[PDB]
Design a binder for this molecule. Structure first.
Ligand SMILES: *SC[C@H](NC(=O)CC[C@H](N)C(=O)O)C(=O)NCC(=O)O
Ligand SMILES: *SC[C@H](NC(=O)CC[C@H](N)C(=O)O)C(=O)NCC(=O)O
Ligand SMILES: *SC[C@H](NC(=O)CC[C@H](N)C(=O)O)C(=O)NCC(=O)O
Ligand SMILES: *SC[C@H](NC(=O)CC[C@H](N)C(=O)O)C(=O)NCC(=O)O
Ligand SMILES: *SC[C@H](NC(=O)CC[C@H](N)C(=O)O)C(=O)NCC(=O)O
Ligand SMILES: *SC[C@H](NC(=O)CC[C@H](N)C(=O)O)C(=O)NCC(=O)O
Ligand SMILES: N[C@@H](CCC(=O)N[C@@H](CS)C(=O)NCC(=O)O)C(=O)O
Ligand SMILES: N[C@@H](CCC(=O)N[C@@H](CS)C(=O)NCC(=O)O)C(=O)O
Lengths: 215, 215
């Protein structure tokens, strides 16, 4: 059974969890708690990883790090990355545009100056969201009728920015619908209600925004 | 003929240029100068881009943004991304590990506190480089005998960190060799000597590190 290792937080790996659950894939997790740095450090170089880091994904011979390599691998095994170079590039474009939002948050979330930095981020956020709002015209998911991994990435990004500004989707009804559509996927509905769902923190526990043991 | 648009800097797009040149692909560039923000802003929404941004790559019907989508697209058209999910994931892992170095620089390069932040980055850099040093044991390129896009990404990262600390590869002879190997690829040798090579800046011109009109 594959092993997905990360801090017991949403962070970089939450879209991967959602994708695995969507696919009904069997996996176990190594979940490092806030005080378990020592535990991670004692395993870091003992797992066969060529590029030791968190998250990791171990699947027989396959030992992977890099969150994006991992999510894309799971997707790839299910024939989800795209049917030709142009569609693969389209999906990678969606992926990167989501990361501009999600990393946009993480870039500032650990700063002493988060509250001032938040102003600048929220000023740019509507422009980024509008691109997705436009993309969703006449589409159920970002690539139309079928789910792709960026859908779970975008889902996670929306979850996160809504904590930062609960009104940030008020101008984007299609994105509001989209978030509900993901939540309506029966596998996702079940997961979000399950003992396996990690609601919080959004970032590493030490973050100024999206950190701490509880919201 | 495809169009690659970016600021006239190395920045996010330099590995893409190197890959195109390696492949002997025909392309033209839209190169925005330091004072040409207005020019970019007047084109940004007039190019058919679904996710307007820099860089962009326009190839007939195909209008792409996201630097990583673009480099991977060029690679994909040349059957370079990997022969199966595991190899594709391996290549995406290399890609992400390079980005930890290259984005590691960009994260701090625009800060007023760059000089203090540099200490922390240079403290972590040897650990990141060692993973690549180990990977290159008995290999010509990162994936062995054949070039892949992360080779050009790593090349660009080494170029950049050597400006920050010219001694940072003193402990990593295989990486030193690697950088020279890339420079010895005849297409790359020619490109680096050509009028098309943009030597500087490394970052946006306004950066504290790797900015300005000249080094
Ligand atoms: S991957 C094969 C090509 N399809 C697409 O590019 C799909 C585009 C959208 N992502 C979608 O509609 O889902 C292909 O061969 N298309 C036929 C063509 O017009 O050439
Ligand atoms: S999908 C966005 C546009 N449609 C609408 O606004 C119709 C009203 C719907 N209730 C809604 O989606 O808001 C649209 O079709 N834009 C593209 C076009 O060709 O006009
Ligand atoms: S949210 C689902 C989409 N409807 C609208 O955008 C209308 C929004 C209302 N005007 C509002 O709440 O303000 C939609 O068109 N969905 C169709 C689809 O194929 O996704
Ligand atoms: S993509 C097909 C598989 N090959 C690899 O994974 C290549 C691994 C390295 N990147 C390399 O050697 O270049 C494959 O089918 N391998 C055969 C097997 O052992 O199953
Ligand atoms: S590739 C690194 C190891 N080889 C050497 O150190 C031999 C000397 C060479 N001049 C050099 O590469 O430095 C090596 O083989 N490590 C793996 C192993 O199986 O020992
Ligand atoms: S740099 C090329 C590799 N040689 C070494 O690592 C030895 C380095 C010296 N000890 C030194 O300069 O300090 C190498 O083994 N290359 C073979 C390959 O297949 O790449
Ligand atoms: N580019 C990497 C970044 C990984 C990373 O920064 N991981 C942090 C957690 S968010 C960590 O704790 N890494 C463990 C380590 O470096 O030992 C990825 O996307 O996986
Ligand atoms: N995730 C994007 C980031 C792109 C980006 O930040 N581009 C900057 C230059 S480094 C820019 O000037 N963008 C133009 C714009 O936003 O209008 C990518 O990798 O392409």
């Amino acid at each position: 059974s594959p092993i997905l290792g990360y801090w017991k937080i949403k962070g970089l790996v939450q879209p991967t969890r959602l994708l695995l659950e969507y696919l009904e894939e069997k996996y176990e997790e190594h979940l490092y708690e806030r005080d378990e740095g020592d535990k991670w450090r004692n395993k870091k170089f003992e797992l066969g990883l060529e590029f030791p880091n968190l998250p990791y994904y171990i699947d027989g011979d396959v030992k992977l790090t890099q969150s994006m390599a991992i999510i894309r691998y799971i997707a790839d095994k299910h024939n989800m990355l795209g049917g030709c170079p142009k569609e693969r590039a389209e999906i990678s474009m969606l992926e990167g545009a989501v990361l501009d939002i999600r990393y946009g948050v993480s870039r500032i979330a650990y700063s002493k100056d988060f509250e001032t930095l938040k102003v600048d981020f929220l000023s740019k956020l509507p422009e980024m969201l509008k691109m997705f709002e436009d993309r969703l015209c006449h589409k159920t998911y970002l690539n139309g009728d079928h789910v792709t991994h960026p859908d779970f990435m975008l889902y996670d990004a929306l979850d996160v920015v809504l904590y930062m500004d609960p009104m940030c989707l008020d101008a984007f009804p299609k994105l509001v619908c989209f978030k509900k559509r993901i939540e309506a996927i029966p596998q996702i509905d079940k997961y979000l209600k399950s003992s396996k769902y990690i609601a919080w923190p959004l970032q590493g526990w030490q973050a100024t925004f999206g950190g701490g043991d509880h919201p």
